[PDB]
């Protein structure tokens, strides 16, 4: 793990589209590092024209930071490539996002795999906080699976690399972020909060049915995501505290890490469930 590697528009190969989003489309590809006769499997994301347009020197900077994230639970930017469009290169993640994944195994996932992912995700965010970096878009759909036992937060820096100039994940945003577009490690803890809920409810859509536009209000009124079925009061409670109105009263990642680590140490005492290696995303990468 080192700094940012700049590629030439002929050092990688787009093999096949895996799926386009709103920030751009992604392909399965190979990396032919000029020099060595080695070819490593990556993932190429070709962003779309940005409204604001940050010159090739600034874009180039944010990319370094994204390239400097060194932690087992936070995808790092391997290589960038500027041409008439920008393309980001990163190590490909076999199983896809942790969201589709938990939905696709709602009866195969045990108390231990959840608690663990919780701890790992905390771990990662705690790192991003140590480096005075705010994610702004944590969410189960942004946690990729390397293996059912190792997950990592992704997309760090991609959002802000285009939409911090003046859509929005309202249901993952903390009150302040919604009302004033305020983002901090404490606002992330809010999101962490939802992310844990998505997991505990095997991929249920949060505030499902309620329009986004209505969220700020119900939120101010004292409304929160419900206690998931499999959650004892102990677990839910922590999910709730990440949704306090006063950011400063929300648990700190280092605290979270410690909590879930403890529970992970007696899973069946905090999560009650009745009682994998696959995902249709994996079927597309084979």
């Amino acid at each position: 793990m080192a700094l940012l590697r700049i590629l030439k528009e002929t050092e990688f190969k787009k093999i096949k589209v895996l799926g386009s989003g709103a920030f751009g489309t992604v392909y399965k590809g190979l990396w032919i590092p000029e020099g060595e006769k080695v070819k490593i499997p990556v993932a190429i994301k070709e962003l779309r024209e940005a409204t604001s347009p940050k010159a090739n020197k600034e874009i180039l900077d944010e990319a370094y930071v994204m390239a400097s994230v060194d932690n087992p639970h936070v995808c790092r930017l391997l290589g960038i490539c500027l041409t008439s469009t920008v393309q980001l290169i990163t190590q490909l993640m076999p199983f896809g996002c942790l969201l589709d994944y938990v939905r696709e195994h709602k009866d195969n996932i045990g108390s231990q795999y959840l608690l663990n992912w919780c701890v790992q995700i905390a771990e990662g965010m705690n790192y991003l906080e140590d480096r005075r970096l705010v994610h702004r878009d944590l969410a189960a759909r942004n946690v990729l699976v390397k293996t059912p036992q190792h997950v990592k937060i992704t997309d760090f820096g991609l959002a802000k690399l285009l939409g911090a100039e003046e859509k929005v994940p309202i249901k993952w945003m903390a009150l302040e972020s919604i009302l004033h577009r305020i983002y901090t490690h404490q606002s992330d803890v809010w999101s962490y909060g939802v992310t844990v809920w998505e997991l505990m409810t095997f991929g249920s859509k949060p505030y499902d049915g309620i329009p986004a536009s209505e969220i700020s209000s119900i939120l101010e009124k004292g409304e929160r995501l419900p206690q998931p079925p499999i959650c004892t009061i102990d677990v839910y409670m922590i999910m709730v505290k990440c949704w306090m109105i006063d950011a400063d009263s929300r648990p700190k990642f280092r605290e979270l890490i410690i909590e879930f680590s403890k529970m992970a140490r007696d899973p069946q005492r905090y999560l009650v469930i009745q009682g994998p290696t696959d995902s249709n995303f994996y079927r597309a990468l084979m």
Binding site: E220, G222, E223, R224, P226, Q227, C231, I245
Partner: peptide, 26 residues
């Protein structure tokens, strides 16, 4: 200490008012 949901149907939300921690004052 689980949720006694009437047929697992887990409701859109859960309220915490009046506790002022989750209830903003306008």
């Amino acid at each position: 200490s689980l949720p006694s949901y009437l047929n697992g149907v887990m409701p859109p939300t859960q309220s915490f008012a009046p506790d002022p921690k989750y209830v903003s004052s306008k």
